[PDB]
Structure 1
Amino acid sequence: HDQMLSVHDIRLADMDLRFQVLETASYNGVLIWKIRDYKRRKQEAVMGKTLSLYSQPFYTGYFGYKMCARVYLNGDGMGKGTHLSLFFVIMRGEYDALLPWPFKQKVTLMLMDQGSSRRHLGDAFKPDPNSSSFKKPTGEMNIASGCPVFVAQTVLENGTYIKDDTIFIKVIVDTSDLP
C-alpha cells in the first residue's frame, strides 16, 4: 500500500504541473511570460543553482509549431555576468510532419515595460535557414537560439522593469504566411 501511495503522490504532482501548462497555453502565436520572484532566482543564477529558465509551450495555432522561450537571468556565453540572455527554442510538435521546414516565421523578442512609459525593449530577427535550431525537431527540444546580449543587467535594474519582483517577457511570432 505504501508503494502505491508513493506512486500516487508522484502522479498527483505531475498532474499539477500539467494543469498549469494548459492554463497558460496560448495558440495565437504570441507568448506572454511571467517570472515571479526575480530576486531569489537571479541570485540562484549567479550561484549556478539554475542557469536558465524555460517558459511554458506556446503555439502559432491549434495545429502549429510547438515553441517555448529560454532566458538566462545572469547571462549566457559572451553576455555572462553583464547582460540578460533570451533564447528562442523550437520544440517537437505532434503535427510537425504537416508543417513546412525549416522554420522561417519572423520571431521578435520583447521585454515588457511595466512602467507608465511602456518603453518595451525588443529585438527582432529572422530565423537562420541552415541552423539546427530551426530544422525539423528530432528530440524533445532543439538548440536554443537568441540574443545573449539582449538587455544589459544594469539597464534592466533601472526600474520600470521589475515590479513586485516580477518580469514580463513577450515573444511575437508572425503567422501571416501560415495556413
Structure 2
Amino acid sequence: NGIYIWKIGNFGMHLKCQEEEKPVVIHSPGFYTGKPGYKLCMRLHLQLPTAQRCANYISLFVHTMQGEYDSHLPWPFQGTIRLTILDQSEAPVRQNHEEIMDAKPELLAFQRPTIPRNPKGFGYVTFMHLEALRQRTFIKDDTLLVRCEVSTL
C-alpha cells in the first residue's frame, strides 16, 4: 500500500505556459508500491485552450515503469489507485479533488513494461478543470500537491 505525494512547484509558470498555448507535460519521479513492489509514476497535462473537448483541464495518468523487482512480481498489475489533488487549507475547511480507479489487468497499461516507462498510461483526461483550482486553496506557495495511493498486495 504505497503513497506518493508529487510536489509540483513553480506552478504559476506552468499555468502561464498553458495560457500561451505552449504544451505542459510533466512526469512525477518514479515511486515504488513497496520494496519489493511495482514502480509507477504519474503524468500530468495542462491541456491547451485549443484542445477540443478537454481544453483547460488537468490530465492525470498513472504509468507503469521498469522496476528493480519486476521479475519477482505478479503480472499484469492489479490494484486500486487513488489520485488526489490536495486542498492545502486547514483540515476544517478542506475538500480534496479525488478519483478512484481500478487497475484492470487486461489493459495494455498494466502489462509488465518492456521499456523504462510504459507509454500507455491510465487515468483522466479531464481530471480537474483549471478554473476549479481557483475555487479552493489548491495552489499554496506556488505548489500543487498530487497524491497517489496504490492499494495492491
Tell me which amino acid in the other structure corresponds to 2:37. Answer: G
Shift of 1:69: 0.9
What residue number does 1:90 align with? 64
Q: What is the aligned length? A: 149
* 1:156-175 equivalence runs, <5 A: 156-175=133-152
Higher strand share: 2
Listed as ranges, the gaps of 5+ residues in structure 1 are 1-27
| Greater radius of gyration (CA) | 1
Relative contact order, higher structure (CA 8 A, sep 6+): 2
What residue number does 1:81 align with? 55
Shift of 1:160: 0.9
Shift of 1:43: 2.2
Are 2:23 and 2:46, in contact at CA under 8 Å, matched by a contact in 1? no
- TM-superposition CA deviations, 1:129-153 (whole Å, max 9, x none): 2211100111111122101111111
TM-score, normalization: structure 2? 0.87
2-structure distance, mates of 1:48, 1:126: 33
Listed as ranges, the gaps of 5+ residues in structure 2 are none
- Asked if residue 132 in structure 1 is aligned to residue 108 in structure 2, the reply is yes
* 1:56-135 equivalence runs, <5 A: 56-74=29-47, 80-116=54-90, 117-135=93-111
Q: Aligned pair in 2 of structure 1 residues 95, 78: CA closer, same or farther (>3 Å)?
A: farther
Shift of 1:91: 0.3
Q: Aligned pair in 2 of structure 1 residues 46, 30: CA closer, same or farther (>3 Å)?
A: same
2-structure distance, mates of 1:48, 1:63: 41
- TM-superposition CA deviations, 1:134-179 (whole Å, max 9, x none): 001111111221011111111112241111111111000013xx2x
Are 2:46 and 2:56, in contact at CA under 8 Å, matched by a contact in 1? no
Work out the percentage of aligned pairs sharing the same amino acid: 35
Higher helix share: 1
Tell me which amino acid in the other structure corresponds to 1:127. Answer: A
Shift of 1:78: 6.2
2-structure distance, mates of 1:163, 1:44: 19
